[PDB]
Symmetry: D2
Subunit: 334 residues, 4 copies
């Protein structure tokens, strides 16, 4: 019943912040505070209303909100980076990428719903530790998933399982064919968020750029499921790795959070007498140098390629990335 799916007297200020939902650089942390730590719920609701997804897929509003609160509730409040705010941020970022001029009218409502839903559940129930940590401790999770994309497989399973809780099935009115297509796309997208698949994804993105085709309109031509799903996988992957491309003020908050999470894993590994994972040793860390390297070897190569695919739609994003790259470089203790 509430205007943003969540009760809030600061609804005025919250409403104002949400006006930037279509903009790169939304004040997601402010929205998290104003919504009473319900950024995923309010942002998803706003986006669904904005894209008219409730009517298009006959999703009852109470069901949508119940599912969103349930999903958000399963992101860990104690985890510094992989929590509901990161989830809300990836959802909103994907939302903007989907609206890029170069992709206008390219994707169907079902593909849009898939990319957005995938973004929302992509890190649900994340414990704050890597796949390797879960594997080396012989966790029940790694056992169930045979050490392959353990967390990613788990995020998907949880995201879908929650649809079964009371009044949570937001896809109850989709046909069997829509549900099967939606389910396959969502799975393909989330499994692509595993960094072990980064290089092959990027390689394929580049190949697409090299043989890039556009329709009579000025938009990208995507013929087969293979090319369509590949763009969606890279889009959500880009959103997941979009932190360095956001206004510095936001970027630095993300860096502080992921570092806090990395160090916590590092402390746990140390306690258990395990080899400390890269960048997880608070006693031997180089936050700034690590951000520069992160940009140079991962983020920039990816976004430069994405920028080429949708040229010149993402020039400003690429420019921000570079300005941010320099800032961290300039703060490296000599």
């Amino acid at each position: 019943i509430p205007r943003f799916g969540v009760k809030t007297e600061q609804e005025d200020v919250l409403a104002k912040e949400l006006e930037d939902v279509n903009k790169w650089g939304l004040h997601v942390f402010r929205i998290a505070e104003l919504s009473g730590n319900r950024p995923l719920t309010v942002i998803m609701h706003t986006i669904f209303q904005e894209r008219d997804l409730l009517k298009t897929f006959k999703i009852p509003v109470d069901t949508l909100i119940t599912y969103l609160m349930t999903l958000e509730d399963h992101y860990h409040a104690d985890v510094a980076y992989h929590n509901n705010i990161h989830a809300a941020d990836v959802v909103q970022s994907t939302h903007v990428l989907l609206s890029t001029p170069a992709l206008e009218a390219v994707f169907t409502d079902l593909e849009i719903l898939a990319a957005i839903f995938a973004s929302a559940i992509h890190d649900v129930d994340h414990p704050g530790v890597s796949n390797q940590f879960l594997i080396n401790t012989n966790s029940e999770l790694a056992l169930m998933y045979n050490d392959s994309s353990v967390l990613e497989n788990h995020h998907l399973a949880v995201g879908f399982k929650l649809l079964q809780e009371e009044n949570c099935d937001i896809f109850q009115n989709l046909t069997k064919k829509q549900r099967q297509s939606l389910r396959k796309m969502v799975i393909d997208i989330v499994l692509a968020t595993d960094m072990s698949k980064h290089m092959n994804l990027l390689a394929d993105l580049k190949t697409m750029v090299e043989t890039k085709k556009v329709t009579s309109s000025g938009v990208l031509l995507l013929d087969n499921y293979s090319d369509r799903i590949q763009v969606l996988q890279n889009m959500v992957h880009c959103a997941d790795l979009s932190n360095p491309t956001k206004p510095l003020q936001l970027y630095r908050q993300w860096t502080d959070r992921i570092m806090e999470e990395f160090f916590r894993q590092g402390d746990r590994e140390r306690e258990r007498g395990m080899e400390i994972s890269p960048m997880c040793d608070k006693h031997n860390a180089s936050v700034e140098k690590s951000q520069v390297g992160f940009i140079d070897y991962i983020v920039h190569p990816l976004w430069e390629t994405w920028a080429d695919l949708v040229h010149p739609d993402a020039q400003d994003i690429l420019d921000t990335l570079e300005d941010n790259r320099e800032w961290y470089q300039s703060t490296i203790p000599q």
Copy 2:
């Protein structure tokens, strides 16, 4: 190791009722369950007795502690540490000197450590009402309690975590049964009938030629251990007021958060979970009058009279809250 001195000194009270469990949490860097459990195992020489390699014990303790939710106000690793330490004290009670075997002692302490592991901070009914996977798995029956048990045992399977690797098959079988029995008894839905048998036992109470309580059959020995851990789980109001108020603050925060969740979901708000219509003080007095005092009064009878100081503290605490009940 500057603080390593404060922690060590603080731990000197591991045998005293009223340990500064919260200070220990901070000093140990939020590892009260691990530190306290380790101290007690060393103290009771449990590692040698059951040949538990030290590295295996600590790895399991950290693993168990890691599965308690840091974001939950009351049902976290601190509560777990508190219940273990309290069980440890109740075990050392005079009236039970040399009564229980080292395996029964291990069981009571182990059960205490894992009794609330992976608690989500919401009640069984909330899990049931939402059709949660946990409730579906356990058929809405002692949902969380069954889960705590399953998780506690399952974690023994992680790398270098099997602390019972050197127990015999017979020992494992007996330990497993006792633990299950003890933890399932922590379900408040078992409280009443649990208390009845505790009274009935105090009525026909018998003593050995040593002045120590006489426990024959499994049924009686397990019932005593069950109530012992149950008393430890409901020992908050018996601790010095200062610790007690911190526990009340914590449980109320947890309750209110559940109520906030129920409200935003359009669900009926659970008793005492509505922050807009609460009676914190009145609920504590009712909690003491109808549950905690009747329970501890009886335990104080069974182990008469080493628990006298505990019961007197309880009654003083009740009066204090009573005096704070709004007009």
Copy 3:
């Protein structure tokens, strides 16, 4: 399965057999054969139609059939006794007991649905081995359910979980109120099928018969949930232990099956160097003596008490039981 809209020869014969669905002693085995091993699906369907349960609870017919076949599919065809035929028999038996004159107009449609649904899923996915066998082998099932009513808890979990497969939620149209009540009653009933609960269950039944109340009609009076569910638990429990009360021809087929299942467990326990459970040693067995003891110590005491509760409705059932008891008795070799 039909043709040109008319029944096939087999279907017609099956239909004729189902005419005895309201009678004690249905040829359930012939029905299993005639239905292509779908006794549970056909008997449940016949009963739902007969009691107008589809309209009452707005259960779409295709959803009911799909769920029934799915549920039946999860009973093990390789298990001699605890299979879909046993399930179908308990369902049909419960169905007959529900119609006893002494209980006319006593239970609500929801309570009737609960008793029948509970009967249908009460042994689903039964492995053919006892709880103790599962406990002694440290099976995953035993681990999950803490060695407590392991199989009974599993039967319920599976029965409910299957409602989540494609087009299987037969309760999709019930209100949350109806669903919570149905679920609680179903759970209470199935958990009551654990033999460990037999004695206390019988004690409470005797107690009820002592304080038994009636009305202007020879109908029983059940004031609260406690007495209503108690009667329902014992009813299904009686149905589960009704083999000895059936005509000898049927009773003997059940005895052969339970003995085969027992001996199979015994052989597995012997293979493994485990102590052979009571009556599971095919080399040291007393089939006749065991059936006599089964009747004297469990079955007769239970049905005698139930007969009292609904006197004289169960007179013929009791008489049949006693005749069968005498037959097995006279069969004991000296």
Copy 4:
């Protein structure tokens, strides 16, 4: 006795392609996986090398065999015993002599033993289409294959079933990875790529000073092991005609049962699963021509001329079934 000797006499062909596995199934009281595995373990001296207590091996084997479905026509304990035995023979081929370590041998054999455990007798697609809990768990990806691994590993935890209890952490970590890699490769959705990489290796075939195959990295090594088990899994058509025919009747019966289930549920009937419109003989020839022969031809190329007889038996059977095609 008699049936005991007949069995022991049959087990003598354990190292030969064409073992009378069905006869062994009958003679052992439906314990083909257990007796054949144990025999092979003795034959390779695996109990000694890895210090596997015999009671633990027999207990695990019976347990694993117990988790294969007796009511499933093809994917049951007999198929598992067969794939195990076939892999055992393929491991002894001359071209591979002295190549694999004992752990890699164990991996290939263990993987073979558990590769289809708890198979329901229906395809991944059927499980996905019905929204089964299994498919939800594994995200519709290699659902059954992932499940077989999970169950095979989980069963080591039952009472006295951990046949790897004496392996070092290093051995366990390596064995686990290899087994996972091998079993996941048995998913037919990976056939094409597997055959491609195999052919590539056949073209860049690096022999050794002993004429045996040369495998540097873990990648080449596992690739051969994965393809070996895959070949074993798809070896029915290369066995003596009397065996091959029994396998065909079984897979057809399993396919038809799935088809009847799909039909009764109003689902599209899967390829070759419609008993009312089938071409058994025709389908076998197609299976040999597009998958089995292409795979074994490449394998024979890798171990040339080691599998010449196996390959010839295949072409032979192919012609038998072909001539069986009515017109």
